[PDB]
């Protein structure tokens, strides 16, 4: 399957303290591998994955240096955004950015990514052509123009298509043993009464990696959509994930329902029922 690198950066302004809090987090195949917190005693990117330990002092100084540069960018942008929206001071605001690149199983580029959010809403995002932008709203229009005029896109497309891909190649080669492993799902079904003549069946999937997975319930061959609740995939705490799908069934006719678990670590889909 495909691969990717991502940097999730957040800056939160705050009343009084003229310096916003800044947190940047990088990921590889959705695994946190480095991290920077401006509030730490000694700000600097820190290896968050074991395969990042082999990176020497020059590597971390360059990374930490960029983070310091980012803080200022975010500090300034937050300030400008506060003006674009005529908001008052003495408050707290959030500005976020997501950057990265997707690679196919062949380790070649699929997509370049770069977008921002303010107050938790899309602000401006670099289009897939890596040449134009999409301004989610009026204020962002001001920003789209500034950037179209400055030609910022060319700089990001350069990073996204070059340095992003190159460095992602390496991290994949270094964290080979860990990043490219797959842990198949372990399934079981639970039973709980719901209402009169009603029953709730829950298809569980535990200890799997990667987090992407598909859980379905079906009645004799047809797939079920109504009265079917899919909870959010959650971390177990040991690097594997869990998820479950529930469906309301008429009391008595339970063996007629079956669920399947799909995951890339599985030769063939798991199939199970509620066995009393």
């Amino acid at each position: 399957g495909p691969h990717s690198m991502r940097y999730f950066e957040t800056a939160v302004s705050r009343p009084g303290l003229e310096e916003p809090r800044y947190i940047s987090v990088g990921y590889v195949d959705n695994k946190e591998f480095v991290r920077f917190d401006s509030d730490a005693e000694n700000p600097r990117y820190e290896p968050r994955a074991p395969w990042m330990e082999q990176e020497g002092p020059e590597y971390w100084e360059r990374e930490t240096q960029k983070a310091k540069g980012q803080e200022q960018w975010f500090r300034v942008s937050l300030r400008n955004l506060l003006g674009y929206y005529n908001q008052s001071a003495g408050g707290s605001h959030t500005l976020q950015q997501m950057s990265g690149c997707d690679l196919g199983s062949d380790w070649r580029l699929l997509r370049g990514y770069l977008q921002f959010a303010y107050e938790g809403r899309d602000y401006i995002a670099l289009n897939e052509d890596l040449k134009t932008w999409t301004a989610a709203d009026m204020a962002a229009q001001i920003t789209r123009r500034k950037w179209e005029q400055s030609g910022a896109a060319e700089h990001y497309k350069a990073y996204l298509e070059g340095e992003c891909v190159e460095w992602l190649h390496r991290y994949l080669k270094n964290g080979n043993a860990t990043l490219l492993r797959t842990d198949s799902p372990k399934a079981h079904v639970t039973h709980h009464p719901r209402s009169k003549g009603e029953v709730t069946l829950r298809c569980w999937a535990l200890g799997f990696y990667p987090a992407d997975i598909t859980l379905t319930w079906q009645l004799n061959g047809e797939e079920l959509t109504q009265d079917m609740e899919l909870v959010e995939t959650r971390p177990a705490g040991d690097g594997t994930f869990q998820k479950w799908a529930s469906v309301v069934v008429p009391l008595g006719k339970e063996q007629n329902y079956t669920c399947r678990v799909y995951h890339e670590g599985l030769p063939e889909p798991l199939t199970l029922r509620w066995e009393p």
């Binding site: 690198m5 940097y7 940047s24 990088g26 480095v34 990117y45 990374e63 960029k66 983070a67 540069g69 980012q70 960018w73 300034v76 942008s77 400008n80 955004l81 674009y84 500005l95 950015q97 950057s99 770069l114 921002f116 602000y123 401006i124 920003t143 500034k146 950037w147 400055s150 910022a152 700089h155 990001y156 990073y159 996204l160 340095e163 992003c164 190159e166 460095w167």
Partner: peptide
């Protein structure tokens, strides 16, 4: 390898 931003919003 992180990116570095150019023109402020």
């Amino acid at each position: 390898f992180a990116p570095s931003n150019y023109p402020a919003l």
